[PDB]
């Protein structure tokens, strides 16, 4: 499944499921769950037999209930595209939220689904929800997915309202975050990652060099990552 051989993955999963089905022990449940995940994902990715994938993921949901598992099942069902599949995904996500409480990942996934489904009432409810997260739920969100979602929801409901205030607040709380300074000032972002305050990759650093729109910096950023498209395109666009 990791390599991409869906047929062999399905064959081996079927063989493993057949070899041990009536067993009841500690080492059998893990294999059963793994085989169900492999079968469902392998069918969905290439076989296009969405009915078999739906049956296997329904069996998996009957057999277990965990945050990551239900989120993955919901994303697969949403990717299927069927109205019944989307309804089942939303229903089981809400059921998990009711059963186990509130978590940032499930809320973010629900917000993304609503934004992609254009539900105005749900969008407003989530915007009320996302803008009042506790500090524990903001220290964990190191990539500031929540502020991006707030900006996206705000600009899609109030014409062209400026949602930079969440970025300003996040920068006030987290002045040493690489993500927050992207929307405010690229100079500060380039300076902060420049000398080892934060750990930045070669592609990101090359992107920072080219964004200063200067011949010397563009040459530097193209020397760092010659396979970057933006760097070569900017160097061509210079002269």
């Amino acid at each position: 499944l990791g390599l991409g051989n869906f047929e062999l993955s399905i064959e081996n999963a079927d063989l493993s499921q057949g070899i041990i089905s009536e067993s009841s022990d500690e080492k059998s449940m893990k294999t059963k769950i793994s085989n169900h995940i492999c079968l469902g994902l392998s069918y969905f990715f290439l076989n296009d037999f969405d009915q078999t994938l739906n049956q296997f993921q329904e069996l998996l949901s009957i057999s277990k209930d965990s945050k990551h598992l239900v989120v993955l099942i919901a994303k697969v069902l949403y990717d299927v595209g069927e109205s019944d599949t989307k309804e089942i995904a939303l229903q089981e996500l809400t059921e998990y939220i009711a059963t186990s409480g509130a978590d940032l990942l499930v809320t973010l996934t629900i917000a993304a689904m609503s934004i992609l489904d254009d539900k105005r009432e749900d969008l407003s409810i989530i915007l009320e929800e996302l803008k009042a997260l506790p500090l524990s739920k903001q220290i964990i969100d190191k990539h500031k997915d929540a502020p991006y979602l707030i900006e996206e929801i705000t600009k899609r409901l109030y014409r062209n309202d400026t949602g930079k205030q969440v970025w300003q607040r996040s920068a006030y709380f987290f002045p040493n975050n690489l993500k927050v300074w992207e929307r405010l000032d690229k100079n500060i972002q380039r300076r902060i990652a420049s000398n080892g305050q934060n750990k930045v990759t070669a592609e990101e650093m090359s992107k920072l060099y080219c964004e200063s729109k200067n011949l010397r910096s563009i040459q530097r950023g193209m020397f760092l990552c010659p396979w970057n498209v933006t760097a070569v395109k900017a160097l061509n666009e210079c002269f």
């Binding site: 524990s136 220290i139 607040r169 006030y172 002045p175 405010l184 000032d185 100079n187 500060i188 305050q197």
Partner: protein, 358 residues
């Protein structure tokens, strides 16, 4: 003790308020929308505060820092200068002058930075007044790379202000960290705060560091305030979604203790701002939990605790997960000395409103 509200102006700004400072003549406020407002300290008791508010547009990126310096120069030359910092990283020194024709104000932008000092980016600053120690005023400013700068302000050379750069002090650590808070003292000491959790102390005369103290996860220095008269320093730590305060003694570099309330933590949420009074016995504390806590430095015990979510009037109450039970509150608080309003208490809150206490 007991604090009584005097004035309350609501919806003062459209963007949130990050810092407030005041002088003996007016109270100046800064918000993220780019407008710098001033409130009249001396006003009639029976009149709305909004009636005497003067606004001025500053910058588009947005402001989060402001400090006002007031002094009497040679003869009767009144001096009122204001400095502030925008989210882009610019220092914006402004002069305030009052028009006697109709009690107006003159927002006058002033430029005091050369072409090379204009290429930096600043976060925190604080004016230094002139005490009996030395005649000249001073100014300190932090940086996104951790560096701190110190000018000597010469107001005359007629009215010809200039800035003379005495020197710079770098960050204690390598690789550097973002400098978050800075402070200056009347005895000649400079303190700087960092998001790592490290506080460094230097002195004005020699520009060498003297002391150095140390503390998902978050331990960031929010506030640093020296004592008005004595040898003491208050530090605002961050715990995992909690607030802490720690006392230190100067000239020895030892630790006195920590302020706490029964559940050591001081506030349920983060602690933002600190402020000493004129003599130096009571310490007020602004928190992100929405409550103000006044402390006695001598006995290290809480004196009172204000709740501004409900006007009518303690234990750290947390839920089953470890989160505060109170909604987010105040960004900044301030003390005003005697004879500034008719001690005071300026408070700018998350509700985009400003409140006063006496």
């Amino acid at each position: 003790k007991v604090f009584i509200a005097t004035a309350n102006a609501g919806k003062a700004h459209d963007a949130d308020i990050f810092s407030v400072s005041a002088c003996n003549s007016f109270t100046v406020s800064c918000s993220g929308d780019g407008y710098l407002k001033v409130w009249d300290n001396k006003l009639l008791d029976n009149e709305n505060p909004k009636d005497k508010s003067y606004s001025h547009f500053v910058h588009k990126s947005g402001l989060h820092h402001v400090d006002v310096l007031q002094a009497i120069e040679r003869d009767a030359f009144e001096l009122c200068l204001v400095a502030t910092t925008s989210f882009s990283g610019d220092l914006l020194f402004y002069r305030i002058t009052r028009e006697d024709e109709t009690k107006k104000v003159i927002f006058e932008k002033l430029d005091l930075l050369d072409s090379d000092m204009k290429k930096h980016s600043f976060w925190a600053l604080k004016w230094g007044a002139s005490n009996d120690r030395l005649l000249s005023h001073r100014l300190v400013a932090t940086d996104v790379k951790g560096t701190t700068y110190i000018w000597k302000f010469h107001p005359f050379a007629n009215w010809s202000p200039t800035l003379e750069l005495q020197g710079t002090v770098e960050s204690p650590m390598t690789p550097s960290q973002f400098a978050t808070s800075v402070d200056i003292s009347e005895r000649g000491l400079i303190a700087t705060g960092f998001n790592n959790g490290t506080v460094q102390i230097s002195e004005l005369s020699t520009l060498r560091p003297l002391y150095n103290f140390e503390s998902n996860n978050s331990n960031s220095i929010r506030s640093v305030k020296f004592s008005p008269q004595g040898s003491l320093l208050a530090i605002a730590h961050d715990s995992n979604s909690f607030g802490c305060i720690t006392l230190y003694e100067t000239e020895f570099g030892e630790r006195i203790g920590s302020l706490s309330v029964p559940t050591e933590f001081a506030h349920s949420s983060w602690v933002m701002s600190l402020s000493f009074n004129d003599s130096g016995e009571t310490l007020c504390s602004a928190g992100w939990d929405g409550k103000l806590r006044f402390w006695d430095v001598k006995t290290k015990e809480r004196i009172t605790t204000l709740n501004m979510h409900c006007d009518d009037i303690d234990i750290l109450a947390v839920d089953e997960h470890g989160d505060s039970l109170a909604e987010p509150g105040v960004f900044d608080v301030k003390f005003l000395k005697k004879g500034w309003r008719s001690e005071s208490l300026c408070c700018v809150c998350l509700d985009r409103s400003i409140r006063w206490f006496r």
